[PDB]
Amino acid sequence: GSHSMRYFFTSVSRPGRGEPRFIAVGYVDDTQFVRFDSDAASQRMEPRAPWIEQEGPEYWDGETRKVKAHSQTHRVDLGTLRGYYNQSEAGSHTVQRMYGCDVGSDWRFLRGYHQYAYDGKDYIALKEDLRSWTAADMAAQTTKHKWEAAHVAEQLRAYLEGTCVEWLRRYLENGKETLQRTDAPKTHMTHHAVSDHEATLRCWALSFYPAEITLTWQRDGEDQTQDTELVETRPAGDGTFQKWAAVVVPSGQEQRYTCHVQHEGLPKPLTLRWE
């Protein structure tokens, strides 16, 4: 199956006394493997997955070094951005940055991307060609012209297309037993009587990995997008995910409803009924 390595940075300003909060997390597909928190004791990049604990001190000194260098770049940003938006020094503000690379099932590069945000809205992003930039505001355009001059896209492309995909492939084989393993959803249905003449039919998908799942309900063979309640996929807390799809059925006719589960670890999709 395909794979991705992504980094999420969140810098939040605390106007009044010190420094921003800087959170950084790294993910290989839906497994998190590292973190850095500005207010954590260590002041180092910490292992959040067993297969990365076996990395060298040199790795951990390199990654601790880069992530806090990255922290300070964002600290300058919250001020500069405040300048760009003519904002006061009394209000808290948030910068988010996300970049990563996608590799196919051949482990040969697919996409690269870098997007940046101010106060939960888009600010600037690298386009799918890894050459040009999408600037949102006129402030974002000043950043575009800076990064255009400093040749950030040319450097960033080399990262996404080179050392990202390389170290991603490495993670994959080093944590093979978890990362390259598809946990198929453990399905089952339930039936609660809503009244004397109606019932909720709820279809479950539990302890699956990766997070991608298409849970679909249908009646007599045709899709039932109506009277379906579909919750967003949630973490179970052990690294697998969960999800349910429910439909309100008139009593005595549960037999015509089928739940359909599609997930990367099922050779053929599941069709389960209630009887």
Partner: peptide, 10 residues
């Protein structure tokens, strides 16, 4: 594995 800070500030 992280890139370096080739990113200028904004």
């Amino acid at each position: 594995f992280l890139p370096s800070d080739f990113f200028p500030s904004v």
